[PDB]
Design a protein around this ligand. Structure first.
Ligand SMILES: CC(C)Oc1ccc2[nH]nc(-c3ccnc(N4CCOCC4)c3)c2c1
Length: 339
């Protein structure tokens, strides 16, 4: 069922995010839109992820971030079983674009600029995306880029980022920073910068840079290119088991970025090196990335807006039962009802 009519009709499948997305014709504004159907109410985790996505996207307004135009759901909590989020329809995504063509450096440069511009806004709101990858970067023929799919987004929590070695993780494997496998829950802004570095590498060659086939193979791929971490980075590794693991490995030299990407712009590779830095404390931050020489032609902090109302506190949804989370989702979606 895709109960969005009679207002939204002529449905066609698009894809799946972290729910199902369809395109539809809006019979009011006479334009095609995208609609995501979410059915989360039987599981507490799905309720938490839905509430976060809706709360975050309703607070955000930025050119490089997908917005929420409308939310469809039943008029009462008792009748509400699905929630439909209506968003701008784009023409394609970076995953699909990279399957069909090789991007020129000036397209890579402009797309990277837009990714970082949107991420500056997200980070300024104390929010983490946590699942940046090509299929979540939407494009149109005018080359406007919009970040979508905030299903795994969280309010940043650097003081509670610590976890053990080889801790299970939800976000897309190929775009996970090395610390996810060593000591991190992915609650700091540096997690998103790593993913952006992976995306830049992928635009440079049309291939994922670290295509791990399984959880620990992901770290194998990363260390295979970055080489063995320094003593100083091992001194920042926190966990006994992570430190022991890394010390046990044979020494691996770093693979020069210009050997992997012999035709890439040297300034793109310098920025790539700084985003794909092993130690998250030494990894470049979003504002620094925007100020890097590779993006000098677009850099303009006066035209790179920040959020008016950041999320100052943890949402504290961990102990709320799915029944309470449904009440909160109902309240958060009320503004879109006819009354
Ligand atoms: C994760 C993904 C499935 O989520 C979305 C969310 C909002 C969206 N708006 N536009 C898209 C989108 C993404 C990829 N291709 C298209 N097009 C629409 C036009 O016909 C071709 C496919 C549209 C989209 C995807």
């Amino acid at each position: 069922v895709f109960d969005v009519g009679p207002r939204y009709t002529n449905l066609s499948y698009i894809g799946e995010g972290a729910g199902m997305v369809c395109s539809a014709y809006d019979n009011l504004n006479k334009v095609r839109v995208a609609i995501k159907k979410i059915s989360p109410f039987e599981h507490q985790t799905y309720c938490q992820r839905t509430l976060r996505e809706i709360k975050i996207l309703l607070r955000f307004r930025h050119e490089n971030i997908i917005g929420i135009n409308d939310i469809i759901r039943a008029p009462t909590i008792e009748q509400m079983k699905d929630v439909y989020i209506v968003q701008d329809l784009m023409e394609t995504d970076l995953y699909k674009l990279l399957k069909t063509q090789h991007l020129s450096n000036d397209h890579i440069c402009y797309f990277l600029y837009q990714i970082l511009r949107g991420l500056k806004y997200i980070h300024s709101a104390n929010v983490l995306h946590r699942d940046l990858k090509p299929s979540n970067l939407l494009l149109n023929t005018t080359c406007d880029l919009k970040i979508c799919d905030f299903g795994l987004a969280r309010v940043a929590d650097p003081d509670h980022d610590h976890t053990g070695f080889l801790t299970e993780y939800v976000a897309t494997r190929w775009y996970r920073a090395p610390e996810i496998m060593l000591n991190s829950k992915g609650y700091t802004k540096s997690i998103d910068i790593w993913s952006v570095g992976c995306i830049l590498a992928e635009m440079l060659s049309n291939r994922p840079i670290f295509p791990g086939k399984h959880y620990l193979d992901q770290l194998n791929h990363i260390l295979g290119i970055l080489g063995s971490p320094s003593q100083e980075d091992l001194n920042c590794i926190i966990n006994l088991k992570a430190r022991n693991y890394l010390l046990s490995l044979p020494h691996k030299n770093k693979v020069p970025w210009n050997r992997l990407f012999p035709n890439a712009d040297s300034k793109a590779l310098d920025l790539l090196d700084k985003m794909l830095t092993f130690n998250p404390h030494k990894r470049i931050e979003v504002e620094q990335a925007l100020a890097h020489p590779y993006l000098e032609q677009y850099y303009d902090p006066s035209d790179e807006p920040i959020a008016e109302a950041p999320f100052k506190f943890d949402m504290e949804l961990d102990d709320l039962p799915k029944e309470k989370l449904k009440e909160l989702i109902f309240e958060e979606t009320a503004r879109f009802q006819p009354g």
